[PDB]
Amino acid sequence: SRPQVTVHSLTGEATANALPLPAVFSAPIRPDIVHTVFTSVNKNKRQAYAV
Amino acid sequence: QVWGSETVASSKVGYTLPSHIISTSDVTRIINSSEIQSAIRPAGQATQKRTH
Amino acid sequence: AKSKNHTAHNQTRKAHRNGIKKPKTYKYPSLKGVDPKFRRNHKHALHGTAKALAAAKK
Amino acid sequence: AISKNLPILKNHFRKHWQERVKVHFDQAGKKVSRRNARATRAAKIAPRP
Amino acid sequence: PSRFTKTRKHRGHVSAGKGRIGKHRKHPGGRGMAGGQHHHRINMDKYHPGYFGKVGMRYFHKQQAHFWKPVLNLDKLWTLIPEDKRDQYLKSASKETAPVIDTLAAGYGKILGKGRIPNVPVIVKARFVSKLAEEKIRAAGGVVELIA
Amino acid sequence: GIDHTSKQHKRSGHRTAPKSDNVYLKLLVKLYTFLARRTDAPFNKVVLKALFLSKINRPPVSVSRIARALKQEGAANKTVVVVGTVTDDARIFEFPKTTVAALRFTAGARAKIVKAGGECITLDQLAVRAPKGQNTLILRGPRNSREAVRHFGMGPHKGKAPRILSTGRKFERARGRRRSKGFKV
RNA sequence: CACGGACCAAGGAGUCUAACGUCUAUGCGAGUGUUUGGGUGUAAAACCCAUACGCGUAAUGAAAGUGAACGUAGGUUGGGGCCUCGCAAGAGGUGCACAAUCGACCGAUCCUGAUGUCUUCGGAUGGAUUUGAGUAAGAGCAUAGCUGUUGGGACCCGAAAG
RNA sequence: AUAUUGGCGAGAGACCGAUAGCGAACAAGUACAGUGAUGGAAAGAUGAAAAGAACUUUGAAAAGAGAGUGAAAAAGUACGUGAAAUUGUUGAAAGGGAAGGGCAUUUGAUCAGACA
């Protein structure tokens, strides 16, 4: 089954209602591809400069 | 719903969650568990004694 | 102005940095230049000897 | 000029092409304009489709 | 990234990787395809055979849509059928319920007989077919309906 | 001074580590480095070296290529090992139940094997099943079927796919290609 | 006893782009490419998407056109690994990729011209020291990086001219 | 629907930061040159506030020396920070037609380490 993460209230106390993991957290964690994608995505908001 | 699971597909067309090339992230557990330890030769010394 | 027309100097030294290699002979060499009449008969000779061997294992 | 095996390229850049370079920086800017034009049109052409 | 280029590694070296006798100039051998028949012939022949001259007949005002004829081999012939209904036709091979495959709607003009098909009667609607593509289809109990 | 016969400080020229930065691939390299060192099995040394290969040195293996290998004599129960990506082939219609081990599986290929009762296994799960490679069979993809291989070794009287952008009439077919215009190649 | 350099400070020379080759990394994979555009938005970002289109999955001929299984998709030789036997050495079996070679199939070319024939149409079957950038259980597409190429002012500075 | 180095009104930048960026951050198309068509610069920074040094003394005067202002005149309208070439003074050392350098040590100067 899923680790059954606990839902918390706005004011401290952990409500006894639990939810399963959405299975997106079990995806592979690849710091290398997230690196290369970030450098290209972060260049999509550049304004052109020229003399 | 947004990324999908083994039940709901993706809610995005033609998309699936990525697969793993290795089933676990702890290589030490695989080596020590039951089967590799019975098929491997005995270990060395982790540092060779300087001879001559 | 004249120049050096030709010399064989350093040519053997260059050839021996990657020294002289044989043409890497193989079994069953290429049948190029063989008599076509012989190859025409040899083609049908290999065809028939692959039929008796195939018929020997039923 | 011709060496080092490569497909023969046909690049038509022998004129003053640098004077007629059009870079579409306004692709995001004009897209907002089309949506703005479509929005301000629909109010003027009340509820026609 | 200019920081990974060899220009940064050439800082301090006089010739910058171009040599002291060569003395890198503007255009030592010409511009573009210059001298393909005079001083680049050894490169034109040997790695570009056939560059000079004409062979065919001219075609004035060629429209590529006139020669539109995508080919589909007998290899698949079933990816055009959806995967959900593919299995229920394979394990129920029989006439009077033969699937109708319109290869024109899928974007194909001619059917070619490269692959081998299972022994299932299949109705094929195509503009063109190969000679032995029809033979393999008819041997399996199918027919080809010529369309336009 | 020493009269050197061979080149000094000459590296072996073979990959000792993967060129990639994949953390999960390095775990498989770490797992198989231990196996290739302390098991004395020749299977573990082949797999470890195959993990170092590049993308063009790891051609995809079709699921149909697996089925042909399983039709050999006494090979129907041999575990198929592919160091690379296993791709789906729709040209086949019958597939056996034999387990297939690979680095990656495409959506069609993984579904095709599981539908036929087979099993998709990663290379780490094979280590606990076959530490020395019991009852295995290694399958590699074809290397010379690549498009870049066609232009390799081009020259006169070779027929080795001249590098061209546009193909057809008027593109490198007249002088040096037929007897009519001077000579043929 | 060839040229530049009296001295000091700052500035000062392989860059960018279009199209590409090899190699490498990544994603998907007989497919691949969201960003022409549309939807949406915390507003040049991010996120989502239809239909087409590009390349690839078929080639070959000047063209009309035709168009890749006699067969466990072939035989032979070498083959990593695996399997069986063995105390081991070795022996046998199976042998992917790759290498060499002989065949098969597709197109072109040169011949052979069957049943049928609006009597000149039709091209079955069989070949050929011929030929193709082919088939023979697909590998490509996209992005990024180094290097290299071509056009651009094109590493920087320089003419006599027009 | 499309174009837009001009004009007007706006919002921005992985752009340049006074030999850069428009030729021009300043009384810049200004000073200035050419008969003329045209050519065409250099030049930003005291301090928070002038509080920009009253007054005394020497000198013909400019200024100097005190005093004074200020957190700082090592901020005084030659003004933030003030490098190098080059120059003065002081101190140290050396020098028989160059000087400078390398290895090694003497001598002088200077610095360092650690108290079971």
From Swiss-Prot, chain D:
Record flagged with keyword Ribonucleoprotein: yes
Keyword set, alphabetical order: Cytoplasm, Phosphoprotein, Ribonucleoprotein, Ribosomal protein
Any one annotated GO CC term: cytosol
Primary localisation category: cytoplasm
Annotated GO biological process: cytoplasmic translation
Origin: domain of life: Eukaryota
UniProt entry tagged with the keyword Ribonucleoprotein: yes
Protein name: Large ribosomal subunit protein eL13A
Whole sequence portion shown: 2 to 50 of 199
UniProtKB/Swiss-Prot annotation, chain E:
Biased composition (Basic residues): 1-13, 20-29
InterPro entries tied to this protein: Ribosomal_uL15 (IPR030878), Ribosomal_uL15/eL18 (IPR021131), Ribosomal_uL15/eL18_sf (IPR036227), Ribosomal_uL15_CS (IPR001196)
Keyword Lyase: no
GO biological process: cytoplasmic translation
Annotated GO CC locations: cytoplasm; cytosol; cytosolic large ribosomal subunit; nucleus
GO molecular function, one term: structural constituent of ribosome
Gene3D superfamilies named in the record: 3.100.10.10
Residue window of motif Nuclear localization signal: 6-12, 23-29
Region feature (Disordered): 1-38
Compartment(s) of residence: Cytoplasm
Keywords: Cytoplasm, Isopeptide bond, Ribonucleoprotein, Ribosomal protein, Ubl conjugation
Pfam families the UniProt entry points to: Ribosomal_L27A
Cross-link named Glycyl lysine isopeptide (Lys-Gly) (interchain with G-Cter in ubiquitin), sites: 95
Function noted in UniProt: Component of the ribosome, a large ribonucleoprotein complex responsible for the synthesis of proteins in the cell. The small ribosomal subunit (SSU) binds messenger RNAs (mRNAs) and translates the encoded message by selecting cognate aminoacyl-transfer RNA (tRNA) molecules. The large subunit (LSU) contains the ribosomal catalytic site termed the peptidyl transferase center (PTC), which catalyzes the formation of peptide bonds, thereby polymerizing the amino acids delivered by tRNAs into a polypeptide chain.
Listed PANTHER family: 60S RIBOSOMAL PROTEIN L27A, LARGE RIBOSOMAL SUBUNIT PROTEIN UL15
Subunit structure: Component of the large ribosomal subunit (LSU). Mature yeast ribosomes consist of a small (40S) and a large (60S) subunit. The 40S small subunit contains 1 molecule of ribosomal RNA (18S rRNA) and 33 different proteins (encoded by 57 genes). The large 60S subunit contains 3 rRNA molecules (25S, 5.8S and 5S rRNA) and 46 different proteins (encoded by 81 genes).
Family under the similarity heading: Belongs to the universal ribosomal protein uL15 family.
Name of the protein in question: Large ribosomal subunit protein uL15
Organism: Saccharomyces cerevisiae (strain ATCC 204508 / S288c) (Baker's yeast)
GN (gene name): RPL28
Swiss-Prot record, chain F:
Keyword Flavoprotein recorded: no
Places the protein is found: Cytoplasm
This protein's UniProt keywords: Cytoplasm, Isopeptide bond, Methylation, Ribonucleoprotein, Ribosomal protein, Ubl conjugation
A GO biological-process term: cytoplasmic translation
Main subcellular location of this protein, as a coarse class: cytoplasm
Domain of life: Eukaryota
Gene Ontology, cellular component aspect: cytosol; cytosolic large ribosomal subunit
InterPro entries for the chain: Ribosomal_eL18, Ribosomal_eL18/eL18-A/B/_CS, Ribosomal_uL15/eL18, Ribosomal_uL15/eL18_sf
Covalent link location (Glycyl lysine isopeptide (Lys-Gly) (interchain with G-Cter in ubiquitin)): 115
Chain ranges passing through the membrane: none
Description of how the protein assembles with itself and partners: Component of the large ribosomal subunit (LSU). Mature yeast ribosomes consist of a small (40S) and a large (60S) subunit. The 40S small subunit contains 1 molecule of ribosomal RNA (18S rRNA) and 33 different proteins (encoded by 57 genes). The large 60S subunit contains 3 rRNA molecules (25S, 5.8S and 5S rRNA) and 46 different proteins (encoded by 81 genes). eL18 interacts with NAP1.
PANTHER family: 60S RIBOSOMAL PROTEIN L18, LARGE RIBOSOMAL SUBUNIT PROTEIN EL18
Additional record remark: There are 2 genes for eL18 in yeast.
Family as reported in the entry's similarity comment: Belongs to the eukaryotic ribosomal protein eL18 family.
Function: Component of the ribosome, a large ribonucleoprotein complex responsible for the synthesis of proteins in the cell. The small ribosomal subunit (SSU) binds messenger RNAs (mRNAs) and translates the encoded message by selecting cognate aminoacyl-transfer RNA (tRNA) molecules. The large subunit (LSU) contains the ribosomal catalytic site termed the peptidyl transferase center (PTC), which catalyzes the formation of peptide bonds, thereby polymerizing the amino acids delivered by tRNAs into a polypeptide chain.
The protein's name in its UniProt record: Large ribosomal subunit protein eL18A
Organism expressing this protein natively: Saccharomyces cerevisiae (strain ATCC 204508 / S288c) (Baker's yeast)
Lineage: Eukaryota, Fungi, Dikarya, Ascomycota, Saccharomycotina
Gene name linked to the record: RPL18A
